[PDB]
Specification:
Four copies of one chain form a homotetramer.
Chain A: E1 3-9, H1 16-29, E2 33-37, H2 40-45, E3 49-51, H3 79-91, E4 96-101, H4 103-114, E5 119-125, E6 137-138, H5 139-156, E7 163-168, H6 175-184, E8 188-190, H7 198-210, E9 216-221, H8 227-238, E10 242-246, H9 258-276, E11 282-287, E12 290-295, H10 296-300, H11 308-317
Parallel strand pairs in A: 1-2, 1-4, 4-5, 5-6, 5-11, 7-9, 7-10, 8-9
Antiparallel strand pairs in A: 2-3, 11-12
Chain lengths: 319, 319, 319, 319
Amino acid sequence: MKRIGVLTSGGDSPGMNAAIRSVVRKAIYHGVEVYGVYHGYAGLIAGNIKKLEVGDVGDIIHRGGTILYTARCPEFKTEEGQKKGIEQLKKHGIEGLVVIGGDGSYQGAKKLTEHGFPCVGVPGTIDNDIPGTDFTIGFDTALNTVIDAIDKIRDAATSHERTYVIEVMGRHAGDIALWSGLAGGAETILIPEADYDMNDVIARLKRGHERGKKHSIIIVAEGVGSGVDFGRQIQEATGFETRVTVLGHVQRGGSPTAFDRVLASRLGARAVELLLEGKGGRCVGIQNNQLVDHDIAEALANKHTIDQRMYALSKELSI
Amino acid sequence: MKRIGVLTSGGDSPGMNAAIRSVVRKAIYHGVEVYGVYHGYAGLIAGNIKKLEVGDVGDIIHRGGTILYTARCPEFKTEEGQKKGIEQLKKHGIEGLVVIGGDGSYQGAKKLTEHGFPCVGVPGTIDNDIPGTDFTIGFDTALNTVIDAIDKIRDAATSHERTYVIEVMGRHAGDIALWSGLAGGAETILIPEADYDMNDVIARLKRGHERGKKHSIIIVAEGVGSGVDFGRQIQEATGFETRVTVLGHVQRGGSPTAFDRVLASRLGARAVELLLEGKGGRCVGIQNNQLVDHDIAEALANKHTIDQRMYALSKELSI
Amino acid sequence: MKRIGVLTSGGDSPGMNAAIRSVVRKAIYHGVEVYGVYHGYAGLIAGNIKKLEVGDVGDIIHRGGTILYTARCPEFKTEEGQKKGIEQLKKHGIEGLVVIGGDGSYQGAKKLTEHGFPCVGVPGTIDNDIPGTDFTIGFDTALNTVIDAIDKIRDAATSHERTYVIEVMGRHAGDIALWSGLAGGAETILIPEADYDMNDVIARLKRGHERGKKHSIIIVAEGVGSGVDFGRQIQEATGFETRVTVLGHVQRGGSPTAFDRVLASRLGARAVELLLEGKGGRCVGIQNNQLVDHDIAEALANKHTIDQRMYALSKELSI
Amino acid sequence: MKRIGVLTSGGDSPGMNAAIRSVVRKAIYHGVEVYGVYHGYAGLIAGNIKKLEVGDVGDIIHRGGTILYTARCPEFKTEEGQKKGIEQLKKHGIEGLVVIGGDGSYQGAKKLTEHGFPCVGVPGTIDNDIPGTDFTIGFDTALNTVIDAIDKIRDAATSHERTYVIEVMGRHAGDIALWSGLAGGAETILIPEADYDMNDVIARLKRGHERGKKHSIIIVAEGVGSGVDFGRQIQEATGFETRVTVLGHVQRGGSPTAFDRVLASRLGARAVELLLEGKGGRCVGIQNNQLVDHDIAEALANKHTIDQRMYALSKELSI
């Protein structure tokens, strides 16, 4: 290849910029031009495309967000969009595309290669529910954003306000809740991939009050329900005053952790390697601490699971 | 005075430990003994009182919360409560008290001196709504906790999710909302001390969208209402996807900023100085960047205000 | 005034971007156009000038550094360079200039104003070493950068390595060292504005050890000496294992604190108001918690001081 | 087992507290009592032993340092101290020991099993220089401390001062240098595990400057040499203004990251599991993203390595 392109699709995730940098620099190191595609798939369709110089990715490795911007475009999930997309790619002489984003981005990448255009997926999202990788770029940053909240709550807790609910992200995936909950010392974690009984939650609460536990912190993934709702139920059932934090999109934001920039730098460069060596239709990832790649269609067919042993352990340690 | 006591009352505030450290160290510096009263006025009534050595306040200056704990004690707002407390103090040879806490905690200080126990109040709250001081210990830290979330929101924003409502604390005081809003570059800031109009607010959003503003941020003081409600009304009226963050008690936790440690160190020491000077029934503060102290009753009789010029400035800059 | 300019000069200070944002927005809000001057005075001379649209300062309020850049321009110290500069301004239809930076930066404003060109100076540096203001934009952020380091060192302290030296910036002023050392609970703070006795330092250190103080931390303003030197003298005199941290340029970097953004916003805005009100040759500032402005040459005549009572206070608390 | 003990030995590492909490809770969850050994192997000999109640490891999971304190004990390096300690253990009825700490603390765990006393090693150190584990507790936290500095330097860089040297920790391991380097976008990284050429280094810097690179960041592991010298040699040879930050012990301090709290929680628990299964004489770790344990002797046999491809990658991306 002589010229590839790169874009970001889906929700923002910390480390997208570090991934864009790696894609751009790796390619330039091998004498390949990199063209930036702005505003996700919609921008591709619209021909919002502009060459990225070696210096255009300077001083972004440590920046949250994405200098290429993002969008949600379901039109690229159609033949028409696929067709317009490829016209713009060809018209700008782009021979391969690196797509950095979530679930929806991989579907687009799969279609693209089914249409004969070489494309590689890079997992850039916070909730860690992309197949073919143990970790997604942004997940680690998000966990740290969450435990910053938990830690402050531990300071703020008093004798009559010792009961706290924190609603985190993860509509279908409980990874954020599980990891941040274990990292935060959460007494109870409500995820989708495991079931909960309110009587147990409430009992854990009372058990801990009795034994002298200074405070109880409850993590609730948005996919399970609303923090405000569980807070009300919990106060109503126990008469403990219960305060609620709803983090929201704060989790999608901020400067990426060390681990996120390293992962993004490694995976972005791999994606370039794969384009240059004639592979396409793949997604990159990290599994068992080793760099991997997979046929996209094959990877999308794998259900996402959490570490149940990790879930059980978080219950054991809050005694 | 051979011996004094120190306690914390009201909601937790970042920097209470710095102020505790200061009280202990200043007094010990002048040869005075210092006793910790744990769990605030409730703990005082209960006689929960232990001597604090010079090293009992090592490694707390940078810690959030309060090593002495707080409580709500309505009982202390009764003659029989003010009696058992006076008794427990005399039992312990405690001749003077430093009370670190919110506006509420000052009542106990007032009465205590009227019954012949010198007491000085030190303003410890994030609300910044204590009289006789431009700033309360904790306010600056709370502000940095808020803009942390606002900054992350800036990274998380996309073309489809570009409207955000963040609800902050401050029961009746818009200080947190106004300062965080200005420093965060909020488009709109809703505070109880200023009339607002939801139609003008919505006009502002639309105007920003028309001129290409990437995202719009709305700060809401809890005194004005729920972030959830304002968000829902904004999305319903405009069709703009609107996300909501409710920080809650996060704002009361965390390690105190430099400003808060410094302010706490100076107010704390000033309080010891006042007792030793034979003063009593006073509250300390900082006004016009100068350390001050006022009679408690005269101070608590002035209504709190915010800087209206700063409010208008925030609207000007956020075009 | 139809058109004004803004530039940054001196070392980088956190909050310069917030001030740039405020200058641009406040002027645009009154229908004045703003032109950016890149690379400071050197840039002004070279005609490195470009218009800033309303959205060009979007998403900078929270960013460290300066999007305009800085540049030590000795050429502007000469009456020749001032001529080429005023030439480029006139050439670009620029009627007034806001200058954001440290000392030297103000000398430029004066001389431009001696030459009848209206210029307002805005205090942007971490040193707190600028007349006509109690605080400079960047100082607060720098303090928090320092105590972050001091805090981490508290965790890393052992019985063996109980003694630490940290060298902080300040140039000729002790503000950073004084405020950070107090904020961080330093046993000893060495600043230019106050006499010190290395023997008393040695004894203070031995005393601390005798009484079980888990660690001693010594803060050294760079304008007093080298952290590595002092660290030697101390290990040699006491046989205590002494470790030295030198922070260096880290103190000029990072995202501005809330107080810095607020100061930056208010002062940048005031600067613009002064230009439109037909003033010139003024510098803005905050004194006694009030917005002020002064004649440059006059303010420049004041010698800088620190609060000696705070310094005293610092010794009293770290026994 | 009906009762076990736990201690920390070696340098302080963020997450030692999370590990301690884990050991304690996991044990108590299976009906086992846990006793704290204070001040490392010296305290085991001196008999500094006290029981740890379930609430005694509350509010420590997010704290840096170690509540058990640490120490250097050469006396335990002997068969006299080893018997003295085995004696102190039995005197309290402790059937098993968990040792959380660095490479040397494992040597101690080896002997104790030799002498018939079941012991497990938990990798607590920032330098990542401990066999039988891809990552040590504290490593991730250290990396983030380092890039916090690198990031701020990025802001502080100007056209005149645009070359920076940061010396980081790692006496014989370049993991910190390597990972923080890659994550922070360092141009050159100097580690023991890789031969380097000051010439290629100077040449890199010069090419960077020619192509318009804004600033150059050089990371130097302490094992390789001194940051101050490297900055002097580099300035001399280039006349490029070169600033040096030496972080020192701040790398060992701070609240643990999410990954470190998770890793500490998982490795601590497994250590307890092993003791209770009767499998003393082992160390736990994470390898290829799975929990492992090894005989200590067999583990200590392996040399420590880094990933040469990551070192190479880091070169490719900083062109």
